[PDB]
Amino acid sequence: MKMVVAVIRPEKLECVKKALEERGFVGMTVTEVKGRGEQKGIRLQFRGREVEVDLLQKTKVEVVVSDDAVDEVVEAIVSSARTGKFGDGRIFVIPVEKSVKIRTGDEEV
Amino acid sequence: MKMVVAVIRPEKLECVKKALEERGFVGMTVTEVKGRGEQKGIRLQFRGREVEVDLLQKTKVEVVVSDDAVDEVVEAIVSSARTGKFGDGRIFVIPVEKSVKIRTGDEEV
Amino acid sequence: MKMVVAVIRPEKLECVKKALEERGFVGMTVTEVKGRGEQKGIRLQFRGREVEVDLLQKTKVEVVVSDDAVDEVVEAIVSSARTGKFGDGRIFVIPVEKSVKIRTGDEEV
Ligand SMILES: Nc1ncnc2c1ncn2[C@@H]1O[C@H](COP(=O)(O)OP(=O)(O)OP(=O)(O)O)[C@@H](O)[C@H]1O
Ligand SMILES: Nc1ncnc2c1ncn2[C@@H]1O[C@H](COP(=O)(O)OP(=O)(O)OP(=O)(O)O)[C@@H](O)[C@H]1O
Ligand SMILES: Nc1ncnc2c1ncn2[C@@H]1O[C@H](COP(=O)(O)OP(=O)(O)OP(=O)(O)O)[C@@H](O)[C@H]1O
Ligand SMILES: O=C(O)CCC(=O)C(=O)O
Ligand SMILES: O=C(O)CCC(=O)C(=O)O
Ligand SMILES: O=C(O)CCC(=O)C(=O)O
Ligand SMILES: [Mg+2]
Ligand SMILES: [Mg+2]
Ligand SMILES: [Mg+2]
């Protein structure tokens, strides 16, 4: 099992949720976060002066899936979150050793 | 070392904190998140019409513990967070390779 | 690749960001969280009476880096976040198996 961790543009959350749902991936954890990547935020022109915003509002989407489902989950997120501009997002894959459903106590290892 | 990541009902946080404390597990990180599981949220009846809420407020509890302590931490969370209804929570176990205490610089590997 | 996860005092975020930037580590994810460590929060005296605050506001800094860069990232965070008092923070290192840039689709494994 793996956890797919995507940090996307907040306005792309609905697109991502729908692309994952259509593929049968419904379970996910969503966190409001802030971040920046390799461009260290954005430079804007305001009243003829350059202004820097080095930390932007982002949405973190965490999806725990089977090892074989990772590539598909990554493809679903890329296809629905992509705009072609800096800041589209990063996806990180982290190993998950155990998964427990609290209600039933069932544990997948 | 492992990180035990529990996503629980927000109203169960105090129960979970107390169950972990009684067992000597005090250190934890708590994040307000949103999510859904296999039932894709909830269906409610409002003014004679069916309404869907597909992302619910949840509380993420992260507890870094020794490898041998995992099962106990998982049991403590299940016993205190469980209601017997859909949405009680999921628990994921993730490997932690290093743990550093900033104040002292001590690092456990 | 590894994810360096630091839980620091909120007032140290700017120091940490600058120390990481000076070393060329710009990409990071920042989350507002709450937590406590081994001292189980703080005890304050208010109106001649002892009061306990068992969960404090903290800032989680997540930095995905190459395996060889971990130690430096940990040193940068320790040097800029340290005050010498309980609550300076914890740093956890978690393995990252894949990293994808959404815009380009490039994947580092
Ligand atoms: N090395 C990193 N460690 C942790 N989080 C990161 C890292 N890089 C980026 N992120 C997170 O991913 C979000 C999206 O990053 P972004 O899409 O700008 O990545 P990028 O590498 O700069 O690619 P691009 O050139 O397409 O912008 C960031 O705002 C931050 O929350
Ligand atoms: N596959 C998953 N990936 C990431 N987070 C998940 C996943 N499944 C559930 N979660 C998180 O766990 C929270 C609790 O999920 P929930 O208890 O409903 O799980 P479940 O598998 O549907 O079990 P149940 O049938 O008892 O409801 C969700 O709201 C979401 O934040
Ligand atoms: N075992 C743990 N599991 C998960 N998060 C933890 C753990 N211990 C501490 N944290 C997080 O790290 C933050 C900082 O912890 P803190 O610096 O107080 O650690 P400590 O072990 O008590 O060291 P110190 O004695 O210097 O205070 C906490 O508020 C919490 O968010
Ligand atoms: O995140 C954005 O929307 C633009 C900024 C960016 O790409 C970055 O900081 O790397
Ligand atoms: O989370 C809940 O409280 C009910 C919804 C649920 O179980 C789910 O979406 O899987
Ligand atoms: O976090 C603090 O600022 C003081 C409390 C502390 O160190 C703890 O709970 O372990
Ligand atoms: Mg970028
Ligand atoms: Mg459910
Ligand atoms: Mg402490």
Numbering used by the authors:
A (entry chain A), B (entry chain A), C (entry chain A): 1 to 109
Quote the study on this structure.
Af-GlnK3 shares the canonical fold of PII proteins, consisting of a four-stranded, antiparallel beta sheet and two connecting alpha helices. It forms a tightly packed trimer with approximate dimensions of 30×54 Å. GlnK proteins, when activated, are sequestered to the cytoplasmic membrane where they bind directly to their corresponding Amt proteins, physically blocking ammonium uptake by inserting the T-loops deeply into the transporters' substrate channels.
2-OG bound to Af-GlnK3 with high affinity, but it did so exclusively in the presence of ATP and Mg2+. In the presence of 2-OG, a Mg2+ ion is clearly identified in the binding pocket by its near perfect octahedral coordination. Its ligands are three oxo groups from all three phosphates of ATP (thereby discerning ATP form ADP), and one α-carboxy oxygen atom and the α-keto-oxygen of 2-OG. The γ-amido oxygen atom of residue Gln 39 completes the six-fold coordination. In Af-GlnK3 the T-loops shift to attain a highly ordered β-hairpin conformation stabilized by six hydrogen bonds involving peptide amides, and are fully ordered in the crystal structure. Residue Arg 47 that is crucial for insertion into the substrate channels of the Amt protein upon complex formation, remains poised at the apex of the loop. However, 2-OG is fixed at the base of the loop in a wedge-like manner and pushes the T-loops outward with respect to their conformation in the ADP-bound state. In both structures, the Cα atoms of residue Arg 47 form an equilateral triangle, but while the sides of this triangle in a complex with the Amt protein have a length of 31 Å, they are extended to 46 Å in the form with bound 2-OG. They thus lose their structural flexibility and are pried apart too far to be able to insert into the substrate exit channels of Af-Amt3. Under conditions of sufficient energy and nitrogen, both ATP and 2-oxoglutarate levels will be high and the GlnK protein will reside in this blocked state.
